């Protein structure tokens, strides 16, 4: 029959759910302060899109999201996405590491079915939020049948980005999110949806990566590369027993003297060395003089959600290079 | 003017000075392998723009450079500067960390006689390699007249950047060097300069960095932020007599409750404790409720670089928070 | 008491005044529907900013801003600001044609208290509509002493840019508003100004411009230039006595055969050409093989502007051209 | 046979082709000076890259190509890639009206073997000729696997784009072809090639406008949006036997009440009026309340060429509003 698409909400937490004493107020404000209920009330226009139940499953700032808890997240939306009553989910999550969030049920997530993260720059109680509009679009997005098979993606502003790419770029604006050489997969212009690209990159229903039944994931730390940096901050990781490490290396992956010594003794240890880069953007190529694999286009905190997948299944360097070069 | 101006091209290394194998090798290469005087030779054509001369400072990767070397390469250009004969210095650096060495010697030059890095990211030896011209449009805007009391620059694929601004954006583009929020301070264009902006920040001539006589910098380390990570890092840096730490925190300087057990220990140890950002760009706001200072518009490179100087004549918070400010 | 600065506020019309019938519509509005103290008291936290005064001039959609009625609005301004009672004004207009109108009064406002134009890409009705904290963030810019003498601004999506470089670059984003090459002059996060540039151009008292006792401009079209674009469009602006034509060019302002053959007509007929470019950024370098003057990195829209105003005080392409290099 | 693929290079011209006085002179060369095996023989690396044939289909520069010789070229490539011997075809054309020829062979080529656009911003004789690593490029592209299906492309400073998205966005520097909100479809850094994106557009195969036996096409211009914008112009295209009207309207198609008048006139002669924008990116939503149909996300120049294909199939509004919203 035809009818509104029935679409969960699963709150978790941040600034769109946040507030502040006023108005006026756009920072130190309480994120994950307000109920998903709040929010749903807020915006009741969702109700003419979709059947919408709201789930709390958290309520905490992004900045102390877990891979524990990232890890249950993946499960229950695999749970939700397996009813035939569950036509697609929409995670609120805050904005400072929603990319992670993003990009680990981009890998995780067994069902085609699509799988909206939203998020607000904005406090619900500043004025001119942005929260309200997006959670709209992030609903409209989640009941459109052309968003299945797309992959996880991220909403907000108007855009639509996928898992992969997108990422915060800016620490305070609304338009933050940006893929500045892949762009975004589509836009909401007019209560319309546009669908510009299709990322092509394994994920979702193809992904060799599953974390059913799986309790904990393997440690990784990440490291900054500059001028001057310490040698010792590499003994302290392979010391508390870290099983990857991603470097944010300067220019494509450039490592210093002190960098390879520290890069080498973890290589020692069994540990997995991934170069990336701390520019933002671009591709770390391969380099068999160097020490390590290189992150492709991935930057740090994606490349780090993806080493800790691929040692869950594989301690072999050559396989986990193409992994970076596929997912 | 009839008279030629007279620019000290300064060497250091870089791609700009690199070398490979084969034309259509732009990765892998060996970085600081040409002389000086071979890259003015390549180029005869800056001869007709001034009476150059070049110097050979130093020959390394730039992920290589260190604070010592930095600092006495600052000390050289404002020697250089002081001299009546001496109108202007390019000096030639890798792209990997000149945005934290021209950022020093923004800061600590004591002239406004124009300091222009140039670099390259293809090797001289690489097919449409880009430092021939860079090197010819670099000379142009030192010995340009306009160019004077505008702060370092960095002048790279027809672009005019200012240290405090530029950085490295991308890993392997030509047109990596940009500053999506403040723009550039000019552009060269059919052989003529075309100045768009100054910048509204203390800098050389009114800055109160004085570095004469020093022989080493306090010690800053950079530490990244995302999920899950360990304080452990904080309690290696504090061990190690760092005097300053920069966050590279999840957008707006966000800290978990893990960063934060760290931050607080190193307070009480007497640390500095400076928030920056992971995102790449954007402005790190104040909030009392969070420890440390805040970084203001500097990324973590630039951060660092300024809380060394800032450590070298006073520890008050009050006054280091006001110089990010204003620097 | 030694306080609050006085504002006025002049309302032109727009979208930020515009309305529809549910918050969900952020098209198929009205522009110029809401009148001026209905802005007021729907940001009543305007107040705690400043006096705020407001002056209905007009109220209608940008789109039919014509250059008559921008021409009173210059000269109601300087009057604005002649008064020792007033220390700057914001002007509500709408977002299509704002940077035209407002880099005329960069043109021609004769005083160094803050000229700042506001506006809203989404209804004033709408969900998460964008009008009122831009009016909040206009008047603090206007307000604030730091903002004197830095030309007319545009204040938008917390970022503050300057009439001659700002442009719409997008149709329907809230983000539109941006100077790729050259940024913005600053930024306004968590209810704090960043100055962060100055433009390196002459405006407002520097600018030898005056219309004040002028009652018409000179007749400037603009014509596109593509693949086979038609001679007789050049033949229609000279027959309806236009006094210049900007052409918004391919490229760098190249021109095909048949529009070689349109300029040659238009300037043996007494017509000024400017060669612009259609690309959006840049600049358009002067050519002695091609006719015409170039526009420098003015684009289409701003072209028009100075050379509509270049034309009330002379003929001299010697000047005019001149006059593009350095406003 | 070599096992090397088969690569056809068609010559029509350009700056890549395009030569000047002084190595110094990237302005005001000669745009289709040299033949297609000058530029063969300057780098001869390609020849490691595919076996390559070189025809010269014209020589000049790209603001001077016309439908009639595009169409041509369509109905060469078209039989060029229907031999056995050709794996695909390289076309070194002008950058200033590239994103026209390549949108329309986007849709006119029935292959998917791959075509691919390449150009240069500074000619052939300038020092840091972009020209040679483009050609490089386009040929390791144009003969990979990896790339057929992926529609009509063009390869510049690294990028790979689509022909529907890619545009000249600034009119003198290397890095002027991007895609703003739709991003590249990959990039090729040390000799590699990585894909990102599919575009979610029909093309190439799966398109309906077949240009086989046509020698002409209906004629459409373009009128730009301004204040105070004319309504002559609009009489005077309809009185050349204009069949189309591609409008670069002020924001989101915006018409003002002398464009309205002009637009009403067209339709009642039987013109078609497509709204587009004069920004540079984004959607002109549609709206019952203005004449003419929507854009979509196409730019002035790429809505004229889909304009006047779309004509040789039929005048049907809603049909023609179709094919925008899908091609």
Known sequence: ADKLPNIVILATGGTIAGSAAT????????????????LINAVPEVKKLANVKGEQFSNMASENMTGDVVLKLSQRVNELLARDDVDGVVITHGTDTVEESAYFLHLTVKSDKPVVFVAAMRPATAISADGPMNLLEAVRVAGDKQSRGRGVMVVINDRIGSARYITKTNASTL??????????????????IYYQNRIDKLHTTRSVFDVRGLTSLPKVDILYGYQDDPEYLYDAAIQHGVKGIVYAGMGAGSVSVRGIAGMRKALEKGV???????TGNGIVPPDEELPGLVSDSLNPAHARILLMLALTRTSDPKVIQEYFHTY
């Open 272 to 278: 997995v060395v991934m170069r990336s880069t701390r």
């Open 175 to 192: 338009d933050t999110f940006r893929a500045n050489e892949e762009g975004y997969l589509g836009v909401i212009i007019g209560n319309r």
């Open 23 to 38: 108005g006026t107020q756009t920072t130190g404000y309480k994120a994950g302060a307000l109920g998903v209920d709040t």
